[PDB]
Amino acid sequence: AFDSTWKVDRSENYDKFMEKMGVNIVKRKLAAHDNLKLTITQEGNKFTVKESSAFRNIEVVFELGVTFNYNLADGTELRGTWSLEGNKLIGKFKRTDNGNELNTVREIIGDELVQTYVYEGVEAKRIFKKD
Numbered sequence: 001a002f003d004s005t006w007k008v009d010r011s012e013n014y015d016k017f018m019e020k021m022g023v024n025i026v027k028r029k030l031a032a033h034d035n036l037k038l039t040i041t042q043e044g045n046k047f048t049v050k051e052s053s054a055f056r057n058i059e060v061v062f063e064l065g066v067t068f069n070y071n072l073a074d075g076t077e078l079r080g081t082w083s084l085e086g087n088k089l090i091g092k093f094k095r096t097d098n099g100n101e102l103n104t105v106r107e108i109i110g111d112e113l114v115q116t117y118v119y120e121g122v123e124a125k126r127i128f129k130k131d
């Protein structure tokens, strides 16, 4: 049951990614965790991501077996991949600065989701909740 409206509750080391990856604050303001909306619209071998925020907006399509894209000179650029194994999804990114590796594993911890991301020395976790 991935396809649905997802609203992040709490986060851990999220700021960590903002520094090591150099993620802007203006965009991170609501994307940090407090006011971040992560939408899931699984479509075939690709999942649509609709992000909702106060004034800012974000979105990124996903495809099992394809690279991630988040190039933003205004904030940061991260390119990786995304794949799902059974009931678990493992996304990834890579910084253009020096091709830094970034890993993310989202598991279904019952009625909630426990996210764990890592990026060269920077590992950030994130507990999820639904609207």
Ligand SMILES: O=C(c1ccccc1)c1ccc2n1CC[C@H]2C(=O)O
Binding pocket: 017, 023, 031, 058, 070, 072, 075, 076, 077, 078, 093, 104, 117, 118, 124
């Ligand atoms: O959606 C983003 C984003 C990243 C860079 C620029 C613009 C948006 C995001 C925030 C936080 C995170 N992402 C991607 C997965 C997770 C992480 O990095 O670990």
